[PDB]
Amino acid sequence: VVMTQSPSTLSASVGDTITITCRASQSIETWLAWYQQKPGKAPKLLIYKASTLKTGVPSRFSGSGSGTEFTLTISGLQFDDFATYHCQHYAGYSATFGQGTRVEIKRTVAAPSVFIFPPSDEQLKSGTASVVCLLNNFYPREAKVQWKVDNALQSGNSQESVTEQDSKDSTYSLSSTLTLSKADYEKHKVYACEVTHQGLSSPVTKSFNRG
Amino acid sequence: DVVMTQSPSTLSASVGDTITITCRASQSIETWLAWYQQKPGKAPKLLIYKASTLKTGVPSRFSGSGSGTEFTLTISGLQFDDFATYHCQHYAGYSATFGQGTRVEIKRTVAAPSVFIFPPSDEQLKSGTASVVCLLNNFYPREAKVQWKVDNALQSGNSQESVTEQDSKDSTYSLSSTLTLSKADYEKHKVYACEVTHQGLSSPVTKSFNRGE
Amino acid sequence: EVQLVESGGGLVKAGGSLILSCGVSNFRISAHTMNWVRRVPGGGLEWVASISTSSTYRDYADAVKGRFTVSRDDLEDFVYLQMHKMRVEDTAIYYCARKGSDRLSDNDPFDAWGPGTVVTVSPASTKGPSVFPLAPSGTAALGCLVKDYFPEPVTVSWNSGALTSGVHTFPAVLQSSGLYSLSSVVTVPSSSLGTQTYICNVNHKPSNTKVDKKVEPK
Amino acid sequence: EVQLVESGGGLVKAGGSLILSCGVSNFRISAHTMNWVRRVPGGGLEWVASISTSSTYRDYADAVKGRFTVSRDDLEDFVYLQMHKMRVEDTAIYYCARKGSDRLSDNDPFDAWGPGTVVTVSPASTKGPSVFPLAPSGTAALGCLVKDYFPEPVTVSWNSGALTSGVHTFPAVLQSSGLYSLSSVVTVPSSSLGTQTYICNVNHKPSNTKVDKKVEPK
Ligand SMILES: *[C@@H]1O[C@H](CO)[C@@H](O[C@@H]2O[C@H](CO)[C@@H](O[C@@H]3O[C@H](CO[C@H]4O[C@H](CO[C@H]5O[C@H](CO)[C@@H](O)[C@H](O)[C@@H]5O[C@H]5O[C@H](CO)[C@@H](O)[C@H](O)[C@@H]5O)[C@@H](O)[C@H](O[C@@H]5O[C@H](CO)[C@@H](O)[C@H](O)[C@@H]5O)[C@@H]4O)[C@@H](O)[C@H](O[C@@H]4O[C@H](CO)[C@@H](O)[C@H](O)[C@@H]4O)[C@@H]3O)[C@H](O)[C@H]2NC(C)=O)[C@H](O)[C@H]1NC(C)=O
Ligand SMILES: *[C@@H]1O[C@H](CO)[C@@H](O[C@@H]2O[C@H](CO)[C@@H](O[C@@H]3O[C@H](CO[C@@H]4O[C@H](CO)[C@@H](O)[C@H](O)[C@@H]4O)[C@@H](O)[C@H](O[C@H]4O[C@H](CO)[C@@H](O)[C@H](O)[C@@H]4O)[C@@H]3O)[C@H](O)[C@H]2NC(C)=O)[C@H](O)[C@H]1NC(C)=O
Ligand SMILES: *[C@@H]1O[C@H](CO)[C@@H](O[C@@H]2O[C@H](CO)[C@@H](O[C@@H]3O[C@H](CO[C@H]4O[C@H](CO)[C@@H](O)[C@H](O)[C@@H]4O)[C@@H](O)[C@H](O[C@H]4O[C@H](CO)[C@@H](O)[C@H](O)[C@@H]4O)[C@@H]3O)[C@H](O)[C@H]2NC(C)=O)[C@H](O)[C@H]1NC(C)=O
């Protein structure tokens, strides 16, 4: 069996009534369940048998549907309800899941403020160079960072991390670290960070020249 | 509980030598011993599945004995195939214990290590790592000690040793030791030395170099 | 001929945990008591654990008793060994051998063995962080780059907790070295860069490491 | 609360093997069908394995079918998942999930989940070595030095087999990086250091990375 879930990201306000849809490629009767998942946590069951609310799950969560179309409704979003959610077909000795939906707090588009930091002299004397590009206070969450050294697109030598939605302004922030030995960093001069984001009409680049 | 007192911890011999080894149980067992060969880094092979009781397919040169407390293994003229470790085992229903294995090895007179020290290649050093190598090229027997000193400071914890098993033409052992340092730390000090002690040496041998000279 | 095939062995850290397993070929384990053995860097064989036919009785050598758990699967022919909170001297080659004979009995030796799998328990149980400044080049951004620390977590404050507005401490990332790294940043008025002092307080409770780093313009 | 705890996470290499396990408390596993699940890079779940009560049935998703193997051992309350031939798309958090309800039935959701353990499959399936000269200071010693490779072997010869007397290549050492190092050496007449050009023809046979290095006085 295969499943689809929509929307992939749902942006809403506190107190809203929202619906998340799951569609099965073939009839699964009422053999479907729903799960809430927080960042860094194992999923928690919400509903099963399509509509059967788990003991202790708040009444604002409900589910409906049979055959190939299923819906999870949250009637009055509370701050705790802004999370990942997943539809899950279950059978006697197996299961399968859809792609999930992420529910977030809606706000206006905000472009990232971009900052690039060169490696500190101390770290550089130890033999390692970690430049850090910062994308501060942007919305929505999708942003792309590309590193270029002497106009050379980097690949495979950076890692990213993103914050959860800020409790006061509902934005995200992102840090990307490009790591290179002292032997590889001193080879090239300019180190740039090319950012694209829904709030930018064209990509933004912040750069520095080694030294 | 049983512990096995196997003897010797190393037996020296040569092709065609008849050899005997002995495992002595710290308290009596009902002749529940077995014996294994083990070649370096391999799985052990069972030779004798009860004391004096040879396993089928094992070469007829093997033999042994058992008395409920004292036990033996014997090989009736060693082949070049036989120069491996041998382990006794006491096996109970749901547990076992083994002797500290008798290492069988090709004999010669004592020979002291030729010691050599190698600085890091400039080509390694520019990448940010310095690997200083100390070579004990040939010696016998196997047991040797190497210590590193940087600016006369005894080092600890930053080296890895490996020994090659007996050479095919002279049966000597050989050791190399690699002292690892980032390029930063290596350029912090001048002299890099290795100090060696061994059965053939009347005093420790030190080889050293000065960084950049 | 018959075969056994150990799997899962590799590098480990002291007080960390790993699980070995052994498969087999040309035979079924459902008839056999199955045993774990090791060869330490000192060259001697140590018995480690065994589990009976019918999974009835589990036994251990006293160095690993209580710390390890032996397990089996008589159907797919697999044996397991959980190694909770390993010691440095748990470093060994770990072999899986079957208690066995042409005709079986209530007491036999180990008549087939697998080629063994290496386990190394490196002695560094926790590693304390390095901390590096993210120097501020309207509003300016500065921060600290915590790096090479194990295990999680690290906590960061700024100016001993007096500076909270505008602070983002990011989730750690796990590097291909097996060590963690995170950055903590704050945006502040550019006018305060000359007078105001900015100190990030990095605490790593697992290593009992505390670092206070002052971040200032280059 | 129902207690589950996974163990055996961490770093792996493409083509490599690992074993996960999960243990439990506040319940006995025998009445439950047990599962493994993962969280792939898009933040979405995938189901990975399910093993029925009494180990009757084992089912897998097509991505892991034939590669992986689930097992269980109810008499100590443990579940296992072997992961042979791991691939980069297996990089995820993994969890041990109970199929269940306040009242168990012939077909149910997953009710109790462990906190999960991370697994990373790094693409370094054949990491090629770094190869460096050991330069000669009546008899002289020279050599070549191999660092930072996986898997074994790195192979070495002197002048494409023209030199064999006095040659030694050492057993590899496993570094704290989880990568191998070794060295190869030869002893020769000191008088020949000026006339004979010693070279080492090498290969990391897994990656088939063929290397050469001339060794001459510094
Ligand atoms: C009335 O009498 C009957 C007997 O007539 C009593 O029943 C018996 O009760 C005994 C005591 O409770 C039990 O003994 C204990 O069993 C456990 C587990 O034993 C397992 O292994 C047995 C042997 O199987 C071997 O050997 C045979 C040949 O002899 C081979 O054919 C076989 O393939 C297998 O070989 C492998 O293992 C060997 C080592 O075991 C190797 O040497 C071989 O090379 C090979 O690898 C096996 O028959 C048992 O069968 C199961 O028994 C379970 C019940 O116990 C049952 O649930 C299951 O369905 C099977 O029938 C087992 O698989 C041992 O570990 C015990 O050892 C002692 O433990 C003490 C600590 O607890 C310790 O102090 C002591 O030193 C010992 O180590 C012990 O032997 C019998 O298993 C049981 N038999 C049966 C048929 O039920 C009955 O209890 C009694 N009633 C009363 C009220 O008097
Ligand atoms: C005498 O011999 C007969 C026939 O050999 C036995 O009848 C069988 O008994 C067993 C055990 O009671 C039955 O297995 C269990 O059946 C349960 C219910 O039957 C199923 O219903 C579903 C629909 O709900 C159908 O789709 C199935 O085809 C069955 O009809 C079933 O719920 C149970 O599930 C098992 O796995 C789940 C996984 O979570 C566990 O939770 C659960 O506890 C259980 O382990 C089993 O499948 C079997 O179906 C019976 N066969 C029939 C119908 O004849 C008698 O039990 C024997 N009696 C004696 C004296 O022992
Ligand atoms: C009466 O006693 C006999 C033995 O004397 C028992 O027979 C054994 O039964 C088990 C369980 O059914 C059999 O195990 C199964 O073996 C399958 C493969 O069998 C073939 O290939 C093997 C070699 O690989 C040969 O040894 C064998 O002769 C066959 O040619 C496995 O694929 C099975 O695994 C699958 O089923 C289990 C359980 O459903 C799952 O957990 C697994 O994941 C997998 O899906 C299974 O392991 C065993 O082979 C039989 N032995 C013999 C000698 O035939 C009877 O079971 C017993 N009677 C009763 C009612 O218990």
- Same domain (yes/no): D67, D160: no
CATH class of the B114-210 domain in this structure: mainly beta
Say if ligand 2 is within 6 A of residue D104 CB.
Answer: yes
Does D56 sit in the ligand 3 pocket, CB within 6 Å?
A: yes
- Tokens (6 digits) for A26: 């073939």
Architecture (CATH level 2) of domain A113-209: Sandwich (2.60)
C71 with C161, same domain? Answer: no
Domains held by chain D: number: 2
C-alpha–C-alpha distance, residues D91 and D39, integer Å: 8
Q: Can you tell me the distance from the alpha carbon of D149 to that of D129, in angstroms, rounded to the nearest whole number?
A: 5
Residues D24 and D79 in one domain: yes
**Resolution in angstrom units:** 3.1
Structure tokens at A168: 């006061």
Q: Measured in angstroms, how far is the CA atom of residue C7 from the centroid of ligand 3?
A: 24
* E strand map for C14-166: 18-25, 34-39, 45-51, 58-60, 68-73, 78-83, 92-99, 110-113, 117-122, 130-134, 139-149, 155-158
The method recorded for this entry reads cryo-EM
Name the closest ligand to CA D53: 2
Amino acid identity for residue A119 in this structure:
P
User: C119 CB contacts (<8 Å, ≥6 apart)?
Assistant: C9, C10, C12, C18, C20, C83, C86, C90, C91, C92, C93, C94
Q: Are both C12 and C36 inside the same structural domain? A: yes
Tell me which of D30, D57, D106, D107 to substitute to probe ligand 2's pocket, judged by most ligand atoms within 8 Å of the beta carbon: D106
**Domain span at C8:** 3-122
- Neighboring chains of C (3 or more beta-carbon pairs < 8 A): A, B, D
Stretch (H or E) spanning A124: helix A121-125
Q: How far is the CA of C75 from the centre of ligand 3 (A)?
A: 7
C99 C-alpha to center of ligand 1: Å? 15
DSSP state of D153: P
Q: Which of C122, C150, C167 is the last residue of a domain?
A: C122
Tokens encoding A6: 């929509």
Point out the domain boundary residue: D61, D94, D122. D122
Same domain? D10 vs D110: yes
Neighbour tally for A9: CB within 10 Å: 12
Q: Say which residues have a Cβ less than 8 Å from residue D44's Cβ, sequence separation at least 6.
A: A86, A97, A98, A99, A100
User: With a CB-CB cutoff of 8 Å, which residues 87-146 of chain D face chain C?
Assistant: 118, 120, 122, 124
The verdict on C73 and C15 lying in the same domain is yes
Q: What count of other Cβ atoms lies within 10 Å of the Cβ of residue D209?
A: 16
Q: Provide CB contacts within 8 A for A56, sequence distance 6+.
A: none
C104 and C163 fall within a common domain = no
Spell out the residues 6+ positions from residue B89 whose beta carbon is closer than 8 angstroms to its own: B4, B33, B34, B35, B36, B96, B97, B98, B99, C45, C109, C110
- For domain A3-105, give the CATH number: 2.60.40.10
Instruction: Break chain B into its structural domains and give their ranges.
Output: 4-106, 114-210
Q: Which of residues 115-154 of B touch D (CB under 8 A)?
A: 116-121, 123-124, 127, 129, 131, 133, 135, 137
From D55, D71, D73, D82, the mutation candidate for ligand 3 (largest count of ligand atoms within 8 A of CB) is: D55
Q: Which of C122, C139, C163 is the last residue of a domain?
A: C122
Mutate which: D6, D76, D119, D173, vs C, most C CBs within 10 A? D76
For a pocket test of ligand 1, which of C56, C102, C103 has the largest count of ligand atoms closer than 8 A to its C-beta? C56
Q: Which chain B residues have a beta carbon less than 8 Å from that of C43?
A: 85, 100-101, 103
Claim to verify: residue C179 and residue C202 sit in the same structural domain: yes
Q: Is A152 helix (H, G, I), strand (E, B) or coil?
A: strand
Residue C74 CA: nearest ligand 3 atom is: 47
Distance from C-alpha of C145 to C-alpha of C205, rounded to nearest angstrom: 17
Of all residues in chain D, the one with the smallest CA distance to C84 is D7
Q: Tally A–C CB contacts below 8 A.
A: 69
DSSP D127: B
Q: What are the strands, taking DSSP E only, across A13-140?
A: 17-24, 32-37, 44-48, 52-53, 61-66, 69-75, 84-91, 94-97, 101-105, 113-117, 128-138
Contact B17, B78 (CB under 8 A): yes
CATH of the domain at D161: 2.60.40.10
Same topology for domains A3-105 and A113-209, yes or no?
A: yes
Q: Which among A39, A165, A177 has a CA at the least distance from the CA of A110? A: A165
Asked if the B4-106 domain carries CATH number 2.60.40.10, the reply is: yes
Does the Cβ of D102 fall within 6 Å of ligand 2? no
For residues C168 and A163, the answer to whether their CB atoms sit within 8 Å is: yes
